[PDB]
Amino acid sequence: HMITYKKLLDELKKEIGPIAKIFLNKAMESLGYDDVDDSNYKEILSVLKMNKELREYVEIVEERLEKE
Amino acid sequence: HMITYKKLLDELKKEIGPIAKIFLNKAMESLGYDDVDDSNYKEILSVLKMNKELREYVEIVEERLEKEG
């Protein structure tokens, strides 16, 4: 059930569609993360939750991933 | 004394080198901020402090800004 780049992008796409890949990559690049895994995914989403435009959508993505 | 984009980029480049430009811009863009000002600079730096390779250097910039304040 481990989180991967593809699982995090697929969940983000369910809420924010065609801007998911570009925002994921921006946040990863800022944070210096060279992959996505269980140890860093929450940190990536925490950055994007601070963006006022994305916040409500990112909350739903985080909640769904935590369930899994 | 207001923090500006130029000021913040100049402080970061002192510690991190030319690449600071891309880290600063990618943090700003992730957060949805189109400028740097007194209201948002600490939040911008908070993102860059979460970068393990940058963290000490960003702490030094924060410290230098606090001293000047």
Tokens of A36: 């996505």
Chain centroid to Cα B11, Å, comes to 8
Residues contacting A40, CB < 8 A, separation 6+? A31, A33
Q: Which residue of A has its CA nearest to B24?
A: A30
> How many domains does one find in chain B?
1
Contact indicator for A57, A16 with CB cutoff of 8 Å: yes
Contacts of B31 in chain A (CB under 8 A): 47, 50-51
Residue A52: left if φ>0, alpha if ψ -120 to 50, beta else—which one?
alpha
Q: Exposure string (b/e) for B42-67, b if CB count within 10 Å is 16 or more? A: eebbebbbbbeebeebbeebbeebee
The resolution in angstroms reads: 1.6
Picking from A23, A28, A30 by the largest number of B CB atoms within 10 A of its own CB, the best residue to mutate is A30
Q: Give the method used.
A: X-ray
CB contact under 8 A, B31 and A43: no
CB distance A40 to A33 below 8 Å: yes
Angle between helices B5-16 and B20-31 (to 10 degrees): 130
Integer Rg of chain A from CA:
11
Q: Residue A17: give the domain boundaries.
A: 1-68
CB contact under 8 A, B50 and A27: no
Contact A37, A2 (CB under 8 A): yes
Per the structure block, which two tokens stand in for B42?
A: 């600490």
